[PDB]
C-alpha cells in the first residue's frame, strides 16, 4: 500500500473574535501603507507575533495572518498607525476578518 496525500488547505479567509484581557490582545502587527512591507511588496497589515497562551492564540489567530477588517473597519490601504489606532480602540471584543496562506 502507498500513501495518498491528505486533504490540505491552501488558502483561507476566517472571522476570528478576540476577547481582550488586561494585558491587551496578545498580538503584534506589522506593515501598512507608507512603511516597509511585512512580506514581499504587499503593504497590507499582518500579524507578526502571537502570545503563546494569549487571547488571540485562544481565538485562533496565527503569525502571518493578513488583517482585512476589524469590527466593521476595512483595513485596505490603511497606514500602520491607522491600523494600530483602530485596534487599540476596538474595545472588549475584537472580531477580525483575516486572509491566511499556507
Amino acid at each position: 500500500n502507498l500513501l495518498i496525500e491528505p486533504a490540505r488547505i491552501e488558502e483561507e479567509e476566517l472571522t476570528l473574535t478576540i476577547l481582550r484581557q488586561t494585558g491587551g490582545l496578545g498580538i503584534s502587527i506589522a506593515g501598512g501603507k507608507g512603511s516597509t512591507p511585512y512580506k514581499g511588496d504587499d503593504e497590507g497589515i499582518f500579524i507578526s507575533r502571537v502570545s503563546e497562551e494569549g487571547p488571540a492564540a485562544r481565538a485562533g489567530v496565527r503569525v502571518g495572518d493578513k488583517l482585512l477588517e476589524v469590527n466593521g473597519v476595512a483595513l485596505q490601504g490603511a497606514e500602520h498607525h491607522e491600523a494600530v489606532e483602530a485596534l487599540r480602540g476596538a474595545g472588549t471584543a475584537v472580531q477580525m476578518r483575516v486572509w491566511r496562506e499556507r
Partner: peptide, 8 residues
C-alpha cells in the same frame, strides 16, 4: 528600514 511592529 525594517518593517514596523506594534504590540497590542
Amino acid at each position: 528600514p525594517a518593517w514596523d511592529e506594534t504590540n497590542l
